[PDB]
Amino acid sequence: NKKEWNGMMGELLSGQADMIVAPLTINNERAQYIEFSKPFKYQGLTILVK
């Protein structure tokens, strides 16, 4: 009876790993539980089409 995470966050919060080094999305929700670093990449969002 609990909203819980999975994936990289599910394996990090469980302590299976030590540190995520990945293109991890900095948002509001994840920083409420963990800390972040200062970003190496600044980029927005756009649409890929054909």
Binding site: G7, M8, E11, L12, Q16, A17, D18, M19, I20, V21, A22, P23
Partner: protein, 420 residues
């Protein structure tokens, strides 16, 4: 006019001391026509019939004070529960003086219970003060008993709110077991070495054996125990250099009861200033009309501030416990008890003795063993994580860039597939 005062198992050097405290309570408290009347009873090892005998003796006595006077009891239950639970029917305040379980501090349950021997949560407060001395962040917790242990964990999380810190590992399980080595290994795999132990004496001896047989008393390790772990077979099986705590004049009994009776006497003679004085009825044969001024008399007893006594300044907190008690900080220097510190409720002072640790030097163990090999996880990102199978056996293809630079690959362990 006449107030009965009840004591249970006054010892044979206290059977006269209790009447002496009754006499001294009538000595300097004015020429008022109130009198006192001492009632002392002695146990037999069945708490059922003794709970019955005590509760109907208090009903026939209509006491205002109920005390607990059991240090020399080898019965490991240590339950003065039923007399306090009977007095809770009329909200009659019971002054415990011996036990240190936080489960007696449940004011939801113990509606009319106060005591002056504050529990091991205050030892965790001492431990947080020692953390503020040594400037530490990551601690390792290990508690067997769950009823006091939830309170100890809650008190410790209340303590960690100031720095907004968190405990590194929680440990709660069934007391009495002998197979705890997997959790000890998972604690060894952590960075810190701060050992916080709150268990029974057999469980403390078990973890001492699992520590001494598994090199856990060497250099870097930070040992920190309390008073249950320095007694009995745990005192027999304790490694040297361990740091425990002790109540200054806590197990002392006669002056303890004398100061408690002085507190009760001046609180009652302050309470006789106020009107609407009710009395306990004869609740043995069918009198369930509860005592009216129960919470009123308890609330008078709550703010009963005192500075006179043998131990010193005695006052009840929001838990109704001894504010700012004296504390000894004991060391096991070559299987010998050596006090190495003192604690007033606001600061720690080490004595002239040296803090000898179970490992190497006398300095503080910087136990934060850093993860020198970081287990790094990532996801398969197409421009960022290029993934190739092994060429022959665990090898890659050492390619160059367009400007003459070998791409620094790594031996990963990626997912073989994405299908469950």
């Amino acid at each position: 006019k006449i107030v009965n005062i009840g004591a249970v198992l006054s010892t044979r050097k206290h059977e006269q001391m209790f009447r002496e405290a009754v006499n001294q309570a009538n000595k300097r408290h004015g020429s008022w026509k109130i009198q006192l009347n001492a009632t002392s009873v002695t146990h037999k090892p069945n708490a059922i019939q003794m709970a019955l005998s005590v509760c109907e003796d208090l009903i026939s006595s209509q006491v205002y004070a109920i005390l607990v006077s059991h240090p020399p009891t080898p019965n490991d239950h240590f339950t003065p529960t039923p007399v306090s639970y009977t007095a809770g029917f009329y909200r009659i305040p019971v002054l415990g003086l011996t036990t240190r379980m936080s489960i007696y501090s449940d004011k939801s349950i113990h509606l009319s219970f106060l005591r002056t021997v504050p529990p091991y949560s205050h030892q965790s407060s001492v431990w947080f003060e020692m953390m503020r001395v040594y400037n530490w962040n990551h601690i390792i917790l290990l508690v067997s008993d769950d009823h006091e242990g939830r309170a100890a964990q809650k008190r410790l999380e209340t303590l960690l709110e100031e720095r907004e810190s968190k405990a590194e590992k929680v440990l709660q399980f069934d007391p009495g077991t002998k197979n705890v080595t997997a959790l000890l290994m998972e604690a060894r795999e952590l960075e810190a070495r701060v050992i916080i132990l709150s268990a029974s004496e057999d469980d403390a001896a078990t973890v001492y054996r699992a520590a001494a047989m598994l090199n856990m008393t060497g250099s870097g390790y930070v040992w920190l125990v309390g008073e249950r772990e320095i007694s009995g077979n745990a005192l027999r099986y304790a490694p040297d250099g361990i740091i425990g705590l002790q109540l200054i004049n806590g197990k002392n009994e006669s002056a303890h009861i004398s100061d408690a009776v002085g507190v009760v006497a001046q609180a009652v003679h302050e309470l006789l200033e106020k009107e609407n004085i009710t009395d306990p009825p004869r609740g043995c044969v069918g009198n369930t009309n509860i005592w009216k001024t129960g919470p009123l008399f308890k609330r008078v007893l709550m703010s009963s501030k005192y500075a006179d006594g043998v131990t010193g300044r005695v006052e009840f907190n929001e838990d109704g416990d001894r504010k700012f008690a004296n504390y000894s900080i004991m060391n096991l220097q070559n299987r010998k008890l050596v006090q190495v510190g003192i604690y007033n409720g606001t600061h720690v002072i080490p004595n002239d003795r040296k803090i000898i640790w179970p490992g190497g030097e006398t300095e503080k163990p910087r136990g934060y063993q850093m993860s020198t090999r970081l287990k790094i996880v990532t996801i398969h990102q197409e421009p960022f994580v290029y993934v190739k199978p092994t060429m022959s056996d665990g090898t890659c293809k050492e390619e160059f860039t367009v400007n003459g630079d070998p791409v620094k690959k790594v031996i990963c362990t990626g997912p073989n597939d994405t299908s469950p």
